[PDB]
A paper describes a structure:
Coronaviruses are enveloped viruses possessing large, trimeric spike glycoproteins (S) required for the recognition of host receptors for many coronaviruses as well as the fusion of viral and host cell membranes for viral entry into cells. The S1 subunit is responsible for host-receptor binding while the S2 subunit contains the membrane-fusion machinery. SARS-CoV makes use of its S1 RBD to bind to the human angiotensin-converting enzyme 2 (ACE2) as its host receptor. Here, we have used single-particle cryo-EM to determine structures of prefusion stabilized SARS-CoV S 2P ectodomain in uncleaved, S1/S2 cleaved and ACE2-bound states.
The S1 domains surround the helical S2 subunits and interdigitate at the membrane-distal apex of the trimeric spike. The S1 NTD and some of the S1 RBD, while clearly present, appear poorly resolved in the cryo-EM maps, precluding a de novo build of these regions. The structure of the S2 subunit appears to be highly conserved across coronavirus genera. The SARS-CoV prefusion wild-type and 2P structures are nearly identical in most regions, including regions proximal to the 2P mutation site. Although the overall structures of SARS-CoV S are similar, we were able to build several S2 protein regions excluded from the wild-type SARS-CoV S models, including a fusion-peptide-adjacent region as well as additional amino acids in the S2 C-terminal connector domain. Whereas most other coronaviruses possess two short α-helices with a cross-linking disulfide bond, in SARS-CoV a similar disulfide bond bridges the two strands of a beta-hairpin. The unique SARS-CoV S conformation of FP2 and the lack of cross-group sequence conservation beyond the disulfide bond in this region suggest that SARS-CoV may use a distinct mechanism of FP2 membrane insertion. In both the wild-type15,22 and 2P unbound structures, the central helix presents as an α-helix in each protomer of the trimer.
Residue numbers in the entry:
A (entry chain A): 707 to 809, 818 to 826, 831 to 1052
B (entry chain C): 64 to 240, 244 to 315, 515 to 663, 672 to 706
C (entry chain C): 904 to 1120
D (entry chain A): 262 to 310
The structure:
């Protein structure tokens, strides 16, 4: 199950957008009041919510459990869910596949850099938690589930062997404990093949992560429309403020410049309003992912069709661009 | 701000032509009322109109006329008499445009012993033909210069003089037992077009103020509209780099790697010029970005292919531990190269600029931008104030503002064993809101 | 013990609500966002929007009624669009309060009026009961939860072989005290004698991994 | 027309936006490659006679 939790967070400089280094334009902006203070306030409030959405999903555990070196817990093979320390990616093998399927404005790219800027006022800010911190929270949730279970989240983590943990979760769905122990060879093999079929789908085909791609594509259309409105005339002589100053006397130059201001200042107000509406939809999905992590990874759900189809046994998070991926292990009778 | 001190002491009789320029702040330490008057005008001659506002020990006399002005205007008080004897400001007057005389009183003109007991404070301004005169007073006990403090000044005159004041001359009093002086001092500061935030109490009395352009802390208080500010990071006004240069291809040389105001053949704007490897065709005069912006140009004199970057811009954020804890802050120049920020600060090319502000040799570049004022600590704590890309800031003992990389949680370990279980043996009841 | 731990935990909450702050920051944010929205709509009355003055009387006094009609109509669309912006953003913010007010109605029925089994719904720990309190523009829930503690290591096993039959626990685990084998539950340590009353009989020995030779009463 | 320029600034391909409905779709999406679906494009009018 694929759930987006956060949105790309942006900022706009009015004077680069509305005027573009024109001094006569800059003076006429003062007659409108402090519009740029309220546009900066609304966009910065959206950006802080995007960091709050990411903390509430992943940062639900207080202790960072070290990845165990034994990854074959009684027949159940977890090497594609935990990070392999031999390969320097600090991600599991499924996260490497997820980070390669989801894949104009100012942006500073690199690692600790190339901080490049554009002639519009548009820029994209980096988030608080980097990708390497997200993958460390996910590896603590997996290795905590593999060795402690419920008590990992609702208290101090209790050591339990893995097969005795599976026996309890079988007991919780109405199937008595001997069904596990007399059939560990079947259940370990069905578990190991079902992970390998997911890994195949994340190399062979596409559209499983379509909800994460939609978050990316909606942010691209919103920025590209705001850029394109710079080219509009709104009835004036030209969309270029220099050609208004060159061709016209300063009385009508003041009128034609003021005509382009309200055209550009209302395109900017439209962008802010619709980012604010879309941020309300990401909170709705990021609050649900925080509910699916506590009630389903850190526990065992009894709600039917919450946490996948079938009787829920356990569940494993994986990180993704701007989202989560939950792998739900369920029991299907036949 | 820097004020200029003048003297009335043994051989020093300071009444020169001092420029006015915008409005002045005048203050005077007195024990013997040496400062009595001012001559305002442009040329200080009888060829135009000037005004004289003097306390002649009987009346306050305000006259705006064509005055035969003295090059040495003064009053004079005899030391063994203790009384005023001379009134030498002008000799004659004609074509008067304004006159006002206040109520009569009797003024202490004699030379006094002891220290300075009285500070009179005036502000003079020109607006719409009016001379605005503001008056304050503070009791002092000093042997020397201007004391520090805050005291409001109330208006006392709006004088419709209609004269052009560009210079002024203070009128002193000469004390002689034949000229001379006695101990007095007068101070001249200049008024500037600036922004203050004024606090008025329940009686309508101004009790406190904040100069919004003194330093980044004060600009933050003007933005929040509060004298008290809690811990956090706070977005405030954008910064720009001002260009310094002019490249025209009359014709000039080509300035590279510097924000200049360029004018190629048909292309104008501000920006940074730098060579590039875009393969123009021989019929392509200039280039464009994925938007509709010119980003490159073929040099019309030597056919070099240049880039055009924007000059620099971004937001400014002020990082504070709270005014309850300290009054030092750190600034973040968002999304900008620290080479451009540091150089334009030293060469005074930024808008906004603050007076009482310095770099401090703590410049650290994160992905969020340039962090100036905080120290880089090589350990990891809980995130206090988030900045971005894994870096937070706080106020620790080293107290000062420090910057560091976040810690995620406690570093722990669960031993895995195939036959060992942990079971709790006691419990607790906990209430959480 | 439980009455005393309950009474002290109420008194620690009462201390936090007199000593310190920021626990009710979400209620203060509702108040502060409504103040900023009204103060911005007030402040737009002072804007000129390109006209002669923000005061309609000065437009009427200084200008002839043809251009007075143009400059007044200029201030109308400036003020009428600031009013339309306020209405749109109050309408967006009202959708966010419904989201939080619907969750509080779910936490009252499923947690005050019942007992929740959803982990991290209704506080951390095993949920026992919960008490509402009123607040300005909100609710405060006091969740009484159970936290286990003082862990202890034991040797365990999945099954016990007795007379050729494998015996499984019906509930709980087998633990080894250090001297003898007991059956217990997982949330509290209370050891009991392994009899056939609490022990599930199924299959033969030497089938599952880790069977202990022992006797079952 | 919709013109495609490569990394050297050389026009390598083009699409006439009024040839057929497929090409008008490519001009709308701004892509030479289009995945399966239904796609809204420009309004039609009947001209009076
Ligand atoms: C748990 O499952 C993993 C599934 O990945 C098993 O690891 C995989 O084992 C195969 C063969 O044992 C490896 O294939 C070989 O890889 C090398 C490395 O390039 C290649 O040179 C060979 O030609 C061959 O293809 C495979 O790489 C390996 N996967 C990983 C991620 O290491 C693992 O054996 C299972 N654990 C147990 C205990 O059975
Ligand atoms: C504001 O000014 C008024 C003066 O009218 C002050 O009110 C007086 O306060 C004194 C106490 O110091 C009382 O004894 C008087 O009866 C008050 N006078 C009146 C007319 O009410 C008031 O204290 C001032 N406020 C502040 C904050 O200084
Ligand atoms: C379980 O824990 C509680 C608290 O940790 C223990 O109760 C304390 O006992 C001491 C006596 O040594 C008292 O002074 C404390 O006031 C008690 N605390 C409370 C909260 O009442 C209790 O002894 C522990 N029981 C076991 C079996 O370990
Ligand atoms: C764009 O044009 C350049 C010509 O400058 C091509 O670059 C050359 O490519 C060949 C390989 O075919 C190399 O051997 C040369 O060293 C390259 N020259 C330079 C100056 O780098 C480039 O291949 C062209 N791009 C495309 C997509 O055709
Ligand atoms: C800043 O500019 C200089 C050019 O002098 C460059 O070498 C440096 O890498 C730039 N730094 C960043 C972070 O872009
Ligand atoms: C005022 O003058 C002093 C030296 O007299 C100088 O050090 C200081 O920098 C000046 N202040 C300003 C704001 O220029
Ligand atoms: C249980 O065993 C582990 C060894 O892995 C040890 O670290 C831990 O302290 C033990 N528990 C107690 C209560 O001693
Ligand atoms: C567990 O062992 C201890 C000593 O090893 C013993 O005193 C105690 O009685 C045993 N528990 C039970 C329930 O018999
Ligand atoms: C558990 O592992 C140990 C080695 O650490 C081994 O001797 C023992 O046979 C194993 N027991 C089970 C039940 O897997
Ligand atoms: C348990 O006892 C049986 C004899 O009844 C023996 O065959 C078996 O090896 C014993 N198992 C262990 C682990 O000692």
């Amino acid at each position: 199950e694929v759930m987006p939790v956060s949105m790309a967070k942006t900022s706009v400089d009015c004077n680069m957008y509305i005027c573009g280094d024109s001094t006569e334009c800059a003076n006429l902006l003062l007659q409108y009041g402090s519009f740029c203070t309220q546009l900066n306030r609304a966009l910065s409030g959206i950006a802080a919510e995007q960091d709050r959405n990411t903390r509430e999903v992943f940062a639900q555990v207080k202790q960072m459990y070290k990845t165990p070196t034994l990854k074959y817990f009684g027949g159940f093979n977890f090497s594609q869910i935990l990070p392999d320390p031999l390969k320097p990616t600090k991600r599991s093998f499924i996260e490497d596949l997820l980070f390669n399927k989801v894949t104009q404005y100012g942006e500073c790219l690199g690692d600790i850099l190339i901080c490049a800027q554009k002639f519009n006022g548009l820029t994209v800010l980096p988030p608080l938690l980097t990708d390497d911190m997200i993958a460390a929270y996910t590896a603590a949730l997996v290795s905590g589930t593999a060795t402690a279970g419920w008590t990992f989240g609702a208290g101090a983590a209790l050591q339990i062997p893995f097969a005795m943990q599976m026996a309890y979760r079988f007991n919780g769905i109405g199937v008595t404990q001997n069904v596990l122990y007399e059939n560990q060879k079947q259940i370990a093999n069905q578990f190991n093949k079902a992970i390998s079929q997911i890994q195949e789908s994340l190399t062979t085909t596409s559209t499983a992560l379509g909800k994460l791609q939609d978050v990316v594509n909606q942010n691209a259309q919103a920025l590209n429309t705001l850029v394109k409105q710079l080219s509009s005339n709104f009835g004036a002589i030209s969309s270029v403020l220099n050609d208004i100053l060159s061709r016209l006397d300063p009385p009508e130059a003041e009128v034609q410049i003021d005509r382009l201001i309200t055209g550009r200042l209302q395109s900017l107000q439209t962008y802010v309003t619709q980012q604010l509406i879309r941020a309300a939809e990401i909170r709705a999905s990021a609050n649900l992912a925080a509910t699916k992590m506590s009630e389903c990874v850190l526990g065992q759900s009894k709600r039917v069709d919450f946490c996948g189809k079938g009787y829920h046994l356990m569940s494993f998070p994986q990180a993704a661009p701007h989202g989560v991926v939950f792998l739900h292990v369920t029991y299907v009778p036949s | 701000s820097n004020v200029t001190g003048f003297h009335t002491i043994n051989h020093t009789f300071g009444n020169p032509v001092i420029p006015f320029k915008d409005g002045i702040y005048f203050a005077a330490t007195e024990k013997s009322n040496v400062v009595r008057g001012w001559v305002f005008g442009s040329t200080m001659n009888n060829k135009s109109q000037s005004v004289i506002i003097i306390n002649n020990s009987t009346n306050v006399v305000i006259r705006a006329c064509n005055f035969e002005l003295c090059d040495n205007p003064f009053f004079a008080v005899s030391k063994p008499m203790g009384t005023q004897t001379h009134t030498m400001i002008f000799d004659n007057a004609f074509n008067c445009t304004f006159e006002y005389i206040s109520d009569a009183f009797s003024l202490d003109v004699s030379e006094k012993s002891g220290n300075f007991k009285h500070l009179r404070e005036f502000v003079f301004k020109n607006k719409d033909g009016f001379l605005y005169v503001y008056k304050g007073y503070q009791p002092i006990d000093v042997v020397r210069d201007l004391p520090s403090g805050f005291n409001t000044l109330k208006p006392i005159f709006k004088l419709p003089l209609g004269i052009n004041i560009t210079n002024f001359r203070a009128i002193l009093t000469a004390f002689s037992p034949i000229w001379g002086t006695s101990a007095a001092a007068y101070f001249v500061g200049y008024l500037k077009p600036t922004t203050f935030m004024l606090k008025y109490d329940e009686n309508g009395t101004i009790t406190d103020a904040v100069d919004c352009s003194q330093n980044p802390l004060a600009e933050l208080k003007c933005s929040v509209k509060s004298f008290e500010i809690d811990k956090g990071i706070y977005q405030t006004s954008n910064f720009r780099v001002v260009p310094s240069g002019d490249v025209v291809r009359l014709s000039t040389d080509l300035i590279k790697n510097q924000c200049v105001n360029f004018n190629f053949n048909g292309l104008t704007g501000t920006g940074v010029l730098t060579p590039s490897s875009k393969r123009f065709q021989p019929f392509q005069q200039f280039g464009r970005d994925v938007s509709d912006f010119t980003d490159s140009v073929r040099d019309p004199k030597t056919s070099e292919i240049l880039d055009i970057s924007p000059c620099a811009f971004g937001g400014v954020s002020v990082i504070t531990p709270g005014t309850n804890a300290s009054s030092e802050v750190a600034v973040l120049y968002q999304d900008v190269n620290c080479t451009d920020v540091s150089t334009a600060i030293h060469a005074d090319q930024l808008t906004p600029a603050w007076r009482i502000y310095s770099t401090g040799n703590n410049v650290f570049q994160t992905q969020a931008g340039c962090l100036i004022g905080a120290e880089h600590v090589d350990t990891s704590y809980e995130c206090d104030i988030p900045i971005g890309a894994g870096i937070c800031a706080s106020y620790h003992t080293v107290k000062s503002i420090v910057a560091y990389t976040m810690s995620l949680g406690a570093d722990s370990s669960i031993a895995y064993s195939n036959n060992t279980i942990a079971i709790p043996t006691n419990f607790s009841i906990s209430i959480t809101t | 013990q439980i009455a005393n731990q309950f009474n002290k935990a109420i008194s620690q909450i009462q201390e936090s609500l007199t000593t310190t702050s920021t626990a009710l920051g979400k209620l203060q944010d509702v108040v502060n966002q409504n103040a900023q929205a009204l103060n911005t709509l007030v402040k737009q009355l002072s804007s000129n929007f390109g006209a002669i003055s923000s005061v309609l009387n000065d437009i009427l006094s200084r200008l002839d009624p043809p251009e007075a009609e143009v400059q007044i109509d200029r201030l109308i669309t400036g003020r009428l669009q600031s009013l339309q912006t306020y209405v749109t953003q109050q309408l967006i913010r009202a959708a966010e309060i419904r989201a939080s007010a619907n969750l509080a109605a779910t936490k009252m029925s499923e947690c005050v009026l019942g007992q929740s089994k959803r982990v991290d719904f209704c506080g951390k720990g095993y949920h026992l009961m919960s008490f509402p309190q009123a607040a300005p523009h909100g609710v405060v829930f006091l969740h009484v939860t159970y936290v286990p503690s003082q862990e202890r290591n034991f040797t365990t096993a999945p099954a016990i072989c007795h007379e050729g039959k494998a015996y499984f626990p019906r509930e709980g685990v087998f633990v080894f005290n250090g001297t003898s084998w007991f059956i217990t539950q997982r949330n509290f340590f209370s050891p009991q004698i392994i009899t056939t009353d609490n022990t599930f009989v199924s299959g033969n020995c030497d089938v599952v991994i880790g069977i202990i030779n022992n006797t079952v009463y």
